Design an enzyme around this catalytic site. Structure first.
Site, mmCIF file in Angstrom:
data_model
loop_
_atom_site.group_PDB
_atom_site.id
_atom_site.type_symbol
_atom_site.label_atom_id
_atom_site.label_comp_id
_atom_site.label_asym_id
_atom_site.label_seq_id
_atom_site.Cartn_x
_atom_site.Cartn_y
_atom_site.Cartn_z
ATOM 1 N N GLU E 59 71.586 65.504 -3.004
ATOM 2 C CA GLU E 59 71.152 64.555 -4.025
ATOM 3 C C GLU E 59 72.186 64.532 -5.133
ATOM 4 O O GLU E 59 72.469 63.490 -5.706
ATOM 5 C CB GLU E 59 69.806 64.962 -4.621
ATOM 6 C CG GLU E 59 69.132 63.847 -5.384
ATOM 7 C CD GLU E 59 68.225 64.347 -6.480
ATOM 8 O OE1 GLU E 59 68.758 64.873 -7.479
ATOM 9 O OE2 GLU E 59 66.986 64.214 -6.352
ATOM 10 N N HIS E 60 72.751 65.697 -5.423
ATOM 11 C CA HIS E 60 73.763 65.840 -6.466
ATOM 12 C C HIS E 60 75.118 65.237 -6.103
ATOM 13 O O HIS E 60 76.032 65.214 -6.927
ATOM 14 C CB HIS E 60 73.976 67.321 -6.800
ATOM 15 C CG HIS E 60 72.964 67.887 -7.744
ATOM 16 N ND1 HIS E 60 73.314 68.486 -8.936
ATOM 17 C CD2 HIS E 60 71.614 67.963 -7.668
ATOM 18 C CE1 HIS E 60 72.225 68.906 -9.552
ATOM 19 N NE2 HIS E 60 71.180 68.601 -8.803
ATOM 20 N N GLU E 136 70.702 74.172 -13.481
ATOM 21 C CA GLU E 136 69.436 73.469 -13.605
ATOM 22 C C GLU E 136 68.299 74.403 -13.209
ATOM 23 O O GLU E 136 67.182 74.269 -13.704
ATOM 24 C CB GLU E 136 69.427 72.228 -12.714
ATOM 25 C CG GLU E 136 70.662 71.351 -12.866
ATOM 26 C CD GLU E 136 70.549 70.081 -12.068
ATOM 27 O OE1 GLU E 136 69.981 70.162 -10.959
ATOM 28 O OE2 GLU E 136 71.029 69.021 -12.543
#
Ligand code: HEM
Ligand code: HEM
Lengths: 421, 49, 101, 55, 443, 54, 220
Positions: E59-60, E136
């Site tokens: 996703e990153h 994160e």
């Protein structure tokens, strides 16, 4: 049945009425008022805030109890949003119930009773309501900014000052409503409804007089500098200058200069290349950060500049790198291509912002309240691209020249003072 | 970080009918509960007597 | 007509709670409704009611009463709570009817 | 106010306070069972006793 | 123009499938602006133990550039057209979508296609994002609510794939290989499992032609056309108590296995969760709020907030509630909460469901408040329910629900069930699984 | 601590019901029977035991 | 000190010399009485430029000498009275630190009369910067100063502080004789000079209360 049209009757006393049947299965009515914390005086500081949380207290026609039970009975909602100079009461519910929820919306904005007990019982909520809001540094500094940027009206905090939590009387609440919730300062906007209906109610149920009652003592500019040392590792900062008022075409320049410098990433965890400012600060610091173009447009004034968030140590570089980044733009650092992109982002943002029921209803009533009119998304689009490459670098200069204000918070150890930028 | 936390393995204790991590434990529930409640019900009967 | 109107004045003197300096409302038994009412009372009214009561209790322990000259007069009796109490009960009834609804 | 009537009631507040919500070490052994047996003995004696005292 | 009608007026959602398997769907509005995206049927549930965290690492990178258009090239092209690109990755559903001018409808699809298919996966960037995700995590770990739901899954679905976090392990993040991210993409981001959805001022036809153009996947063997069926996740009446008397408040979440998207009861479950609702210290309502729990919460200062939930999944799900409280009111709160649950199974009133249904419909409508949300409903509906479900239908279904039905269904899923518990913080007061297990019956 | 009248598990009780117990300042003689009743009970029990012995 | 004391030696960590800002902090709090203090950099400890300020201080008036007095010998006080109607208090503020100092005036007054009291205190300071100082004023202040000082050392603490303060800054000990000289060596000029250095230099300001009628630094 397709798309109708956006009507907007303007009754005698001054009460504006703008509706728009979009056949959405849900309606969303709302009383936009020209009220706010700026009309406050040292004397009644915060009353505006407490009035905002009084929405559920008894009214001359609906008890505290019935208001909440009534609305919930139909799956309806009642909310109150408010800026330093704008209060928006408004309900929302499935179409088939608009009558039901209307009484309450009405009773609330025009029939408050502010019973002493119900009131004093409520004031402790200020304590709470404030504590949560203040969880985001974002808000703390902005309160202080306004305090520094101005000397009055707009210098008033949006959240009741502490010393006054619990000292706001019922009188103060009434007088505030009587002197500001006037038919000429009000606008009854609506969506998912027919103008004939929304109008009917407005005239058949509203009574309050008109006339700006008490007017606000025009905002004087100060150019302050408030610093809040608090340890918190991340340093929030915001540097601004007086900007453009509402309507002002000059304001359109700033909106463009805004998007030119960069107004917060568009790609998840992006890099924001189309963002002059962001990009500039990156090439300056090593650690994580965030910097954007700040821009507010109020009735008789405005604020413009940049807001940054960075590690304490890199506060100096991030902040200064944001200044030079703003001067370089003031010194022809703007491409005709930059100006064209920003004009899209701007057109995009705006256009998107009105997809949500609230976004549209706010877009409508905001204008319908300021000038009982309604620019078509067509005209607004013009006012944008009418901005020239010059206009932009102009705004850019008006910043580097004008007197600035600054607000910060955190371990300000490596943070610079206004007179160092 | 809480992502590195796993519930340990309880096979040494799990009831034979809920040992397989890929079978709806629900189907055997009525029995697991039916059995235990039976013991109890019986105990009550005895005490009652 | 003006029958029970004088009847009332009679009863008011017969009851005698005024020989203690109390108003009709002071003698009210504090059930839920009354307690809620007492809460809404402006401070002066509340502080006053207190003193009246505290003085009456002192009179009772003493086995005395106020001099005839200080007894409250039927027509000067202030029903300082009566109205609040009405609302309180009114408010409650609504909730009640509503919750059975 | 008190939600449940198990922690508020002047009497239950007691049965609950000493035989239900009473905090107890997680590890007490069988050697901790005599306190209640002792209590049950007391009750049993008193009871059978009254029964005998009647004759 | 009564509600009923406005419902049967909303334009139908069109769906057309391609030879590769890709399913294109959309709801056309006059909106000048719009939203389009690809809703893949992949998540952490598809990941196994060795690659837990791939879909998130991936996703990153779906935004740091493709083979054709590198980083700046991508961002520049996208930022400059005033479009917003962004996405997410759940346990069993991943999504990537853009917010652009209905005008750009076709260029966007090209862009979408270029992301799901040609992700650069620049091994240079990988090592950077590795440090970002790791960062994160440090942050998300301070989100009690998250920690609490992850844990909830961690024990409710212990031993299965659903008991893993989406973000994955600290080890996997530290060691995943370009190759891993590579295959993840190849194995999961596949046509028959993806759904190109759009909403706004867009021609379905124009939409699908654009789809045909860049979403030109090829399928030779049957294997490719097939959608795998995941192994069933076993629910377990259990609890996990992560205690830290140093945190200000305590979080508590309790739940029972839910049915799964397909099951009609879900409607009833939602109507029920609609009765108990949710609360929070800034709800103006106050002591008069309709939800007894909320009301009780207010009268007794039982919690800073509480909320019911019915998290659905393909074959399973979690039906429960979560509340944040002070160390010393955790018990009273838990007590009252189970109280209402037991009340749901035994004494729900017609008046309650009436309010509940209305409130529900209102939420149902807010689920379609904009091109993006609408889009999200399409992508998900097709993905989950197979087809699209119109408010007119939902509304229908909802109306069928009544007290009796709520009680039967709730009893069915709640009464005398071994719940899953997760507690975090200064949780000494709340206690004993047994005491809580008995709260599951009589009420 | 401070005083052993309010802390001691037992005295805390005698003090809690017969010493620091708050009472209306105006209760009359008609409030004396509670204890007389109590005293009767004690007196009865006591003379009773004495009699039961014979 | 010797055979008993110990610890490290040398100035250890030194202080990063005080940079002057000239800020403006306002604290709105409702409190009826408005406190305010306006200053400018003044003189540092030791500096003869201080002596002037000490004298200018007593010239302007540094807090009444007669119980519930009027302070006629107080230019400042007297000046503000002739300006407001209600009760108040205004004095000559003065601190002397190692590498810098602060000088100005501190006022307390009703909220409403905050504007007049504060401004009246400014003009009162300019009038002194514009030759508003008599050679007689300068001589009286030189006594008050000599008095104050001399008295301040009657109490055990007062004397011990006087001694050690010096004994620490310069391991010496001026005799009350010498200190006396440094005072009267102040000329009428020196005083009006300091007076000017105030009206010219950048100022700082601190306030608190219902600042409703209180002026901002850029209004004095
Ligand atoms: C502390 C609990 C008690 C203990 C330890 C206890 C013990 C005894 C013992 C050891 C005897 C002689 C038993 C025998 O015949 O071998 C006895 C007899 C008796 N007890 Fe108790 N007793 C208790 C309570 C009571 C009470 C409360 C009553 C009745 C008010 C009672 C009534 C009698 C009577 C009637 C007998 C004599 C006849 C008989 O021996 O069965 N006892 N008790
Ligand atoms: C509630 C308290 C008590 C009351 C109301 C009470 C009342 C009485 C009454 C009315 C009689 C008949 C008196 C008469 O001969 O005219 C009596 C007799 C008796 N009571 Fe009680 N009594 C009490 C407590 C006790 C207790 C606790 C005992 C001993 C354990 C006891 C032992 C006796 C005895 C031995 C007699 C029979 C011989 C006699 O009449 O003197 N009593 N009692």
């Amino acid at each position: 049945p397709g798309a109708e049209d956006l009507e907007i009757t303007k009754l005698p006393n001054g009460l504006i009425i703008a509706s728009l049947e979009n056949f959405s299965p849900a309606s969303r009515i709302g009383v936009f008022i020209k009220a706010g914390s700026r009309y406050e005086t040292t004397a009644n500081l915060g009353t505006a805030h407490l009035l905002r949380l009084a929405s559920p207290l008894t009214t001359k026609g609906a008890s505290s109890f019935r208001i909440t039970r009534g609305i919930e009975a139909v799956g309806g909602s009642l909310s109150v949003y408010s800026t330093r100079e704008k209060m928006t009461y408004c309900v929302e519910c499935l179409r088939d119930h608009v009558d039901t929820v209307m009484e309450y919306l009405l009773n609330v904005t025009t029939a408050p009773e502010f019973r002493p007990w119900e009131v004093t019982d409520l004031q402790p909520q200020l304590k709470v309501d404030k504590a949560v809001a203040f969880q985001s540094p974002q808000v703390g500094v902005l309160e202080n900014l306004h305090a520094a940027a101005y000397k009055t009206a707009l210098a008033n905090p949006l959240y009741c000052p502490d010393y006054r939590i619990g000292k706001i009387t019922s009188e103060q609440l009434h007088h505030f409503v009587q002197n500001n919730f006037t038919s000429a300062r009000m606008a009854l906007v609506g969506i998912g409804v027919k103008h004939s209906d929304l109008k009917q109610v407005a005239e058949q149920f509203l009574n309050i007089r008109s006339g700006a009652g008490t007017s606000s003592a025009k905002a004087t500019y100060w150019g302050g500098e408030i610093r809040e040392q608090n340890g918190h590792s991340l340093v929030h900062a915001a540097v601004v200058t007086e900007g453009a008022a509402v309507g002002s075409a000059e304001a359109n320049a700033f909106s463009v200069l805004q998007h030119v410098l960069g107004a917060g990433p568009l790609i998840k965890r992006g890099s924001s290349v189309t963002s002059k400012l962001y990009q500039g600060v990156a090439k300056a610091t090593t650690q994580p950060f965030d910097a954007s173009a700040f821009n507010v447009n109020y009735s008789d004034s405005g604020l413009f500049g940049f807001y940054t968030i960075s590690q304490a140590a890199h506060a100096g570089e991030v902040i200064r790198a944001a200044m030079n980044q703003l001067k370089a733009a003031a010194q022809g650092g703007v491409t005709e291509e930059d100006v064209t992109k920003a004009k899209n982002q701007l057109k995009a943002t705006y256009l998107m912002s009105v997809e949500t029921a609230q976004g549209l209803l706010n877009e409508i009533g905001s204008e319908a309240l300021l000038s009982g009119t309604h620019t078509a998304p067509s005209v607004v689009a013009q006012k944008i691209d009418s901005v020239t490459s010059a206009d932009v670098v102009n705004a850019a200069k008006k910043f580097v020249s004008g007197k600035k204000s600054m607000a910060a918070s955190g371990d300000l150890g490596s943070t610079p003072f206004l007179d160092e930028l | 970080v809480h992502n590195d936390v796993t519930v340990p393995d309880f096979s040494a204790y799990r009831r034979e009918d809920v040992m397989d991590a890929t079978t709806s434990s629900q189907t055997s529930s009525e029995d697991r509960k039916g059995f235990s409640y039976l013991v109890t019900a019986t105990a009550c009967v005895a005490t009652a007597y | 007509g003006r029958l029970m109107d004088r009847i009332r004045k009679w009863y008011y003197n017969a009851a005698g709670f005024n020989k203690y300096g109390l108003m009709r409302d002071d003698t009210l038994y504090e059930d839920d409704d009354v307690k809620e009412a007492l809460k809404r009372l402006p401070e002066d009214l509340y502080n006053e009611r207190m003193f009246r009561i505290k003085r009456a209790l002192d009179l009772s322990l003493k086995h005395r009463i106020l001099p005839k000259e200080q007894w409250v007069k039927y027509e000067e009796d202030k029903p300082y709570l009566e109205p609040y109490l009405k609302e309180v009960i009114r408010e409650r009834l609504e909730r009640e009817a509503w919750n059975k609804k | 106010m008190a939600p449940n009537i198990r922690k508020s009631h002047p009497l239950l507040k007691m049965i609950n306070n000493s035989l239900i919500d009473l905090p107890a070490p997680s590890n007490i052994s069988a050697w901790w069972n005599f306190g209640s047996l002792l209590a049950v003995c007391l009750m049993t004696q008193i009871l059978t006793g009254l029964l005998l005292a009647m004759h | 123009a009564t509600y009923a009608q406005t419902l049967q007026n909303i334009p139908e959602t069109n769906v057309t499938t391609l030879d590769n398997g890709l399913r294109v769907a959309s709801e056309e509005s006059s909106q000048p602006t719009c939203t389009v995206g690809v809703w893949i049927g992949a998540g952490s549930r598809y990941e196994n133990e060795k690659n837990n965290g791939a879909g998130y690492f991936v996703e990153h990178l779906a935004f740091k550039g493709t083979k054709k258009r590198p980083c700046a090239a991508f961002e520049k092209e996208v930022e400059s057209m005033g479009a917003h690109f962004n996405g997410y990755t759940s346990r069993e559903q991943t999504a990537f979508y853009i917010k652009a001018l209905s005008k750009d409808m076709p260029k966007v699809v090209e862009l979408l296609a270029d992301v799901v298919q040609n992700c650069a996966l620049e091994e240079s960037q990988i090592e950077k994002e590795r440090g970002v995700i790791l960062q994160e995590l440090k942050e998300m770990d301070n989100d009690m609510t998250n920690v609490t739901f992850d844990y909830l899954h961690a024990t409710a679905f212990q031993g299965t794939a659903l008991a893993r976090t989406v973000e994955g392990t600290t080890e996997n993040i530290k060691h995943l290989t370009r190759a891993d991210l590579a295959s993840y993409i190849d194995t999961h981001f596949k046509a028959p499992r993806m759904v190109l959805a759009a909403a706004g001022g867009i021609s379905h036809k124009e939409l699908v032609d654009a789809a045909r153009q860049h979403f030109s996947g090829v399928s030779f063997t049957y294997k490719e056309d097939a959608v795998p069926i995941l192994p069933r996740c076993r629910f377990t009446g259990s609890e996990i108590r992560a205690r830290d008397d140093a945190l200000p408040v305590a979080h508590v979440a309790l739940a029972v296995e839910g049915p799964g998207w397909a099951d009609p009861d879900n409607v009833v479950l939602h109507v029920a969760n609609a009765i108990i609702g949710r609360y929070d210290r800034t709800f103006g309502g106050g002591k008069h709020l309709s939800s007894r729990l909320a009301a009780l919460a207010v009268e007794h200062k039982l919690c800073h907030s509480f909320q019911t939930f019915n998290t659905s999944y393909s074959d399973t799900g979690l039906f429960g509630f979560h509340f944040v409280a002070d160390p010393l009111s955790i018990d009273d709160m838990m007590f009252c909460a189970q109280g209402e649950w037991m009340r749901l199974c035994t004494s729900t009133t017609e008046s309650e469901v009436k309010r509940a249904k209305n409130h529900l419909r209102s939420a149902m409508v807010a689920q379609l408040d904009g091109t993006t949300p609408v889009c999200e409903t399409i992508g998900s509906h097709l993905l989950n329910y197979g087809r699209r479900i119109s408010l007119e239908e939902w509304d229908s279904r909802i109306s069928a629900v009544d007290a009796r039905m709520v009680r039967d269904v709730c009893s069915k899923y709640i009464y005398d069930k071994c719940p899953a518990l997760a507690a975090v913080g200064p949780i000494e007061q709340l206690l004993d699984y047994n005491r809580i297990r008995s709260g599951m019956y009589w009420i």
